[PDB]
């Protein structure tokens, strides 16, 4: 019945906040000024549960180990091992002196799966381990009023329906219902995604419990001021709690890489059972009994399963994940490293992910000129002209008349990332003056503050009078700031390059259009002004007691405006440009106000310049919006207020006809609906978020990306990839590496899949032509799990053949990892030449030892017999059992060496899929070592003392080392001219048939 629970969680929350204080207190039975008695609080504490989210569902380590021992690839090797023991059972109990080949192979396959499980498990567990070192859960106590007394208790010890007081800086414990506020501004950034610090007013404002101001929220911090409130929701019943529980209860889906692995297995086992069944029927048609034919069936099918490809693919993914971890881009999932490359639509979060989520000084107005300040997090932008006197006056008005100062440990931290006490606006101004106008430390005390006038509830203004330390004038310096309309109403003089001028409308209207320029840009603007009081009328001893008119409200000297907003992160615009360059559709999904979301989208690249919305065209023609055609609007903004009353088909149409989309004022549940809508198109979706609202979106998306520091812990756990450095450019690195490793996997797979033809053809013609076995089991293991291991891994180190960030994202229904072209090359052409070369070495050895190839036909009937010790060759010589058997094993060993020689050229041609080996170049040092190690190991397996006794691999007469040479050169030349024709003829045949 959990379906209904998850459904009740996908619905947007409701509340009873809109209630009179008497109605609220009667519903909760709580005193508004004294809270409640401690006994009642303890009774509720032991009634419904402590105020804390239920811990995540613990995942035992043996469970995820067993998880790594299963899957799809390991499952194929498991059925292979089981088929080996089945064939062994059919061989042990039915025939005399049964061979232990199948048993050896079965336990080997089991060991392959187990070892791969241990390695992959250690990697995923290592990621989870370093992730556990990031839980810096510091206990936080709340201020609760109970029985009429102020008590500071643990957050979990807080209950429902009791008065709670919060001070500027304290984090809101539970979900409160504000009853009495005083300049209280809370930070709803991590929950609803509202950028600027939304104030909290006790009066009911909006029907939406999120946009309203009489509700404090879980995981939100009180920015400034103080407030009181009755606890309404506690623990998991909270807003962010109901969101977190939803994130834990959503499905992860199937990664694209895993789906490609499954499709690959479909083709592998398809041809495996086809060959096994057709050859089983053929063997029964010949002479072999059902007893032997069954072994032939299981043998041909099992032999067609790449035993070593599991470890090679796992190591490949692990290597790319290693590179991800080097750039502080951790991946909790070993296959999630690839999902970025296949992604075709990225749903980003504005506040926190795209933006820095911090008020920063944007632009300044000086001498009727707009000056853009540097808004980069690392300070790597253009610096404004900081030399004029107007800048000095403006900077003094901002640095002096502002209730903001640094804190205790703020000394070694940078100027921006450090902590500041006060309003977010005042903090931005303080950071700007401390970064561009020297230091505000001595600049503040240089002007002794006499009398201050803080901000006002109505007709907001902040002024103060300061002394003057300049050695040229003893007059008093009065400074004031506020909303541009208030300053325009209380000013007459205007500052320009040092001197003053009247309020002439020629430059005053020039100030008004600049005000609308910065305001329309989605920023918050503040006007700054100052004036010199006449020391003749206000002497150095006349204390301007704060009661009456001691300062001229009007006749002040306006210096300029100072705008501010949360700027996007440093490499965010460039990264978005790269994603759109790669063909990835960027869709901003945020619950912030549209007035800012549209501007940020224009500033990052989600809304291109020149593209208009339906409302933009309606405004450009001075006509109602119901007239213009939405098809004439490339981009569109979707208000969350309107998204609620929408169907699936409507959202589908929004995505299909609008290329640049910005979802604003969207609830976390609506973020989930948006991601599901993008997934209905059949595209790969990546969601990059930070707040708790991005938790249900990061969990359902094909790949979730969380911020390593600015991201909430819930969404950070529900994500599949973490950016420890918060560098959004890692998204670009990710899509690049994902496409790269995808192609490298294709190459590596084609390599291991090429060796299957010469591995199985000996046993096939052993049944057809009735000739001695050309290649044994152990020798095949020396190729699949021995030599070719390093070449396959080295194939992961291959670089880009062309610009991968220039091509469009891969089509999930078309560009598969293992297409029919790959099989047409490995199983069809290259592996065929390798098999012919192996048989060549076979006949070379047997003919040189006295068994001409023509004479080998029908010889296995007596060749494998252990007692016919007088088998006649072509020269009349009689060979005993062990003599000809020694020849057979010393015939399996060079066949294996032949596999290595042909794999030389096969590796070189698989290294490049389109470019000539001369174009790409043998610069892969791991590949060079892959050839040296492969060759040296192959020689060691033949010439080491005791190999014919342990592995039955006898030494090779040196001439054998040159039997396969022409076949290898042939493979290299054929594939080289193939890629040459694909280069010169990019049209049809060579590309659509062989290019994989």
């Amino acid at each position: 019945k959990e379906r209904d629970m998850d459904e009740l969680k996908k619905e947007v929350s409701m509340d009873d906040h809109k209630l009179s204080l008497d109605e609220l207190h009667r519903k909760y039975g709580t005193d508004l000024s004294r809270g409640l008695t401690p006994a009642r609080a303890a009774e509720i504490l032991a009634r419904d549960g402590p105020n804390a989210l239920t811990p995540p569902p613990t995942t035992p380590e043996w469970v995820k180990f067993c998880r790594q021992l299963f899957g799809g690839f390991s499952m194929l090797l498991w059925i292979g091992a089981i088929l080996c023991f089945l064939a062994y059972g059919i061989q042990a109990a039915t025939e005399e002196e049964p061979q232990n080949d199948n048993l050896y192979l079965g336990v080997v396959l089991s060991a392959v799966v187990i070892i791969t499980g241990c390695f992959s498990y250690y990697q995923e567990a290592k990621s989870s381990k370093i992730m556990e070192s990031f839980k810096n859960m510091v206990p936080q106590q709340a201020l609760v009023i109970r029985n009429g007394e102020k008590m500071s208790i643990n957050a979990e010890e807080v209950v429902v329906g009791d008065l709670v007081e919060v001070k500027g800086g304290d984090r809101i414990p539970a979900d409160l219902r504000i009853i009495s506020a005083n300049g209280c501004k809370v930070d709803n950034s991590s929950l609803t995604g509202e950028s600027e610090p939304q104030t909290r007013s006790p009066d009911f404002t909006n029907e939406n419990p999120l946009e309203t101001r009489n509700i404090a929220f879980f995981s939100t911090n009180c920015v400034e001021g103080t407030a009181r409130g009755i606890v309404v929701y506690t623990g998991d019943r909270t807003v962010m709690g109901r969101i977190a529980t939803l994130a834990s209860g959503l499905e992860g889906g199937q990664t694209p890489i895993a789906a490609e692995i499954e499709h690959f297995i479909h083709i592998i086992t398809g041809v495996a059972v086809f060959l096994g069944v057709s050859f089983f029927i053929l063997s029964l048609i010949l002479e072999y009994t059902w007893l032997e034919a069954v072994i032939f069936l299981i043998g041909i099918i099992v032999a067609n399963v790449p035993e070593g490809l599991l470890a090679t693919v796992t190591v490949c993914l692990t290597l790319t994940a290693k590179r991800m971890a080097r750039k502080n881009c951790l991946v909790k999932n070993l296959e999630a490293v690839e999902t970025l490359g296949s992604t075709s639509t990225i749903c980003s979060d504005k506040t926190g992910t795209l933006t820095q989520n911090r008020m920063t000084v944007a632009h300044m107005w000086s001498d009727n000129q707009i000056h853009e300040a540097d808004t980069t997090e690392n300070q790597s932008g253009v610096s404004f002209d900081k030399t004029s006197a107007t800048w000095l006056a403006l900077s003094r008005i901002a640095g002096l008349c502002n209730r903001a100062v640094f804190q205790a440990n703020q000394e070694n931290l940078p100027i921006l990332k450090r902590a500041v006490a006060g309003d977010a606006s005042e903090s931005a101004l303080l950071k700007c003056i401390e970064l561009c106008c020297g230091s505000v430390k001595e600049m503040r005390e240089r002007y002794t503050k006499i009398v201050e006038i803080p901000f006002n509830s109505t007709n907001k203004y902040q002024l103060s009078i300061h002394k003057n330390p300049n050695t040229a004038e003893p007059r008093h310096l009065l400074v004031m700031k506020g909303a541009p309309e208030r300053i325009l109403d209380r000013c007459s003089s205007i500052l320009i390059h040092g001197k003053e001028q009247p309020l002439d409308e020629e430059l005053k209207d020039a100030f008004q259009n600049a005000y609308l320029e910065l305001g329309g840009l989605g920023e918050r603007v503040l006007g700054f002004c100052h004036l010199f009081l006449p020391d003749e009328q206000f002497p150095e001893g006349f204390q301007f007691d704060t009661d009456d008119v001691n300062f001229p409200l009007d006749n002040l000297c306006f210096v300029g405006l100072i705008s501010m907003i949360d700027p996007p992160r440093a490499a965010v615009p460039d990264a978005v440009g790269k994603c759109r360059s790669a063909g990835i559709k960027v869709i901003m999904v945020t619950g912030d106000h549209p007035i800012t979301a549209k501007a940020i989208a224009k500033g990052v690249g989600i809304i291109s310049e020149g593209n208009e919305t339906v409302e933009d065209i309606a405004a450009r023609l001075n006509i109602p919006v119901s007239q213009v055609n939405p098809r004439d609007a490339k981009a569109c903004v979707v208000h969350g207020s309107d998204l609620k009353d929408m169907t699936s088909e409507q959202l589908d149409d929004i995505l299909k006809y609008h290329t640049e989309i910005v979802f604003a004022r969207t609830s976390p549940q609506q973020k989930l609906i948006i991601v599901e809508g993008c997934q209905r198109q059949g595209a790969i979706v990546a969601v990059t978020g930070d707040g708790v609202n991005d938790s249900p979106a990061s969990k359902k998306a094909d790949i979730g990306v969380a911020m390593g520091i600015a991201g909430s812990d819930v969404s950070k756990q529900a994500a599949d990839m973490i950016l420890l450095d918060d560098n959004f450019a890692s998204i670009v690195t990710g899509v690049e590496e994902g496409r790269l490793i995808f192609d490298n996997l294709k190459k590596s797979i084609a390599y291991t899949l090429t060796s299957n033809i010469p591995e199985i053809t000996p046993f096939l013609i052993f049944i057809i032509a009735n000739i001695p076995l050309p290649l044994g089991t152990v020798t095949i293991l020396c190729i699949d799990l021995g030599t070719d291991m390093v070449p396959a891994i080295s194939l992961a180190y291959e670089q880009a053949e062309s610009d991968i960030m220039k091509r469009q994202p891969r089509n999930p229904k078309t560009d598969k990892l293992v297409n029919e072209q790959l099989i047409s090359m490995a199983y069809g052409q290259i592996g065929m030449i390798q098999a012919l070369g192996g048989f060549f070495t076979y006949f070379v050895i047997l003919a040189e030892n006295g068994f001409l190839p023509i004479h080998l036909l029908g010889l296995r009937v007596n060749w494998d017999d252990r007692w016919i010790n007088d088998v006649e060759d072509s020269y009349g010589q009689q060979w005993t059992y062990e003599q000809r058997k020694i020849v057979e094993f010393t015939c399996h060993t060079p066949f294996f060496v032949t596999i290595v020689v042909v794999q030389w050229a096969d590796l070189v041609i698989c290294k490049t899929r389109r470019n000539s080996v001369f174009q790409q170049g043998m610069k892969n040092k791991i590949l060079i070592f892959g050839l040296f190690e492969e060759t040296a190991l192959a020689a060691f397996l033949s010439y080491c003392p005791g190999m014919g006794v342990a592995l039955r691999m006898y030494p090779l007469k040196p001439t054998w080392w040159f039997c396969a040479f022409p076949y290898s050169l042939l493979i290299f030349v054929y594939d080289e001219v193939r890629k040459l024709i694909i280069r010169r003829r990019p049209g049809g045949w060579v590309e659509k048939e062989t290019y994989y």
Binding site: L836, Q877, W879, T880, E882, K957
Partner: protein, 291 residues
């Protein structure tokens, strides 16, 4: 998604007809060239070997020692009464000695009467084809006394006290070298040490050596071995219908209804042994005449 069989826009099993023809034609030409290349290289390989001698002969360094009853496990278990119990043995003995009858060796142009006494080796020039088809020394069944007879189409062999002849593995250019007169304890044998390769049978342990009472050997002129006048071998091409020497061994005093192991070890300097191949040089048999 697995009904891509056909469509009204021409696709079969996944692709169109013209595409099926293009791919099939390509694969036929490609595989045809691959086959021609493999055939040409295998032809060069055939050109690197001669018709009168194998290039490598070291894998047959120690010659083997086989017997006439090619038993399933080198075991001779039968009943002295039931004629069908030992039919599988007698059939193989008659088929083996079918090429040694006096009528089979009748042409004087390919057969040469070696002699009634084992003599020195007979080298018929070099192994080239400059000389004609070499002659093969005759070997009549009369040499294997008590194990040849003058029986009819069916060689009435020994029911009690069976016969087991031994044969030396035919090797090209192999010249057997019997041990020097300084015989290092070689189990009583005749003084004809210079022109015959000795072969002596015995038990395997203190039990088998006791159960096997008396053994009687038969050979050319009565010597337990192979005469050097029949070596070396010049290949099947130059010496067809060649008859390698034979030597019979009869176990007279056996313990009926008891499986006993016999090891017939051939001695000589050019005769090697192997702990892995119980047939290289030596030879084993498990006789059990259960009545």
């Amino acid at each position: 998604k697995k009904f891509i069989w056909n469509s009204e826009k021409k696709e079969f099993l996944g692709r169109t007809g013209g595409s099926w023809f293009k791919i099939l034609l390509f694969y036929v030409i490609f595989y045809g060239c691959l086959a021609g290349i493999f055939i040409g290289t295998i032809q060069v390989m055939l050109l690197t070997i001669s018709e009168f001698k194998p290039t490598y002969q070291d894998r047959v360094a120690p010659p083997g020692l086989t017997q006439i009853p090619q038993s399933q496990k080198t075991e001779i278990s039968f009943r002295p009464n039931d004629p069908q119990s030992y039919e599988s043995y007698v059939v193989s003995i008659v088929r083996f000695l079918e090429k040694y009858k006096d009528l089979a060796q009748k042409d004087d142009m390919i057969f040469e009467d070696c002699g009634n006494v084992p003599s020195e080796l007979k080298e018929r020039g070099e192994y080239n084809n400059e000389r004609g088809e070499r002659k093969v020394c005759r070997f009549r069944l009369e040499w294997l006394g008590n194990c040849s007879g003058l029986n009819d189409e069916t060689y009435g062999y020994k029911d009690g006290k069976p016969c087991v002849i031994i044969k030396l593995n035919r090797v090209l250019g192999f010249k057997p070298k019997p041990p020097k007169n300084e015989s290092l304890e070689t189990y009583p044998v005749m003084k004809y040490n210079p022109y015959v390769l000795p072969v002596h049978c015995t038990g395997k342990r203190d039990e088998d050596k006791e159960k096997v009472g008396t053994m009687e050997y038969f050979g050319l002129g009565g010597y337990p071995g192979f005469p050097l006048q029949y070596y070396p071998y010049y290949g099947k091409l130059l010496q067809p219908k060649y008859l390698q020497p034979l030597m019979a061994v009869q176990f007279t005093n056996l313990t009926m209804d008891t499986e006993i192991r016999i090891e017939c070890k051939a001695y000589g300097e050019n005769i090697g042994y192997s702990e892995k191949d119980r047939f290289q040089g030596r030879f084993d048999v498990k006789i059990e005449v259960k009545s």
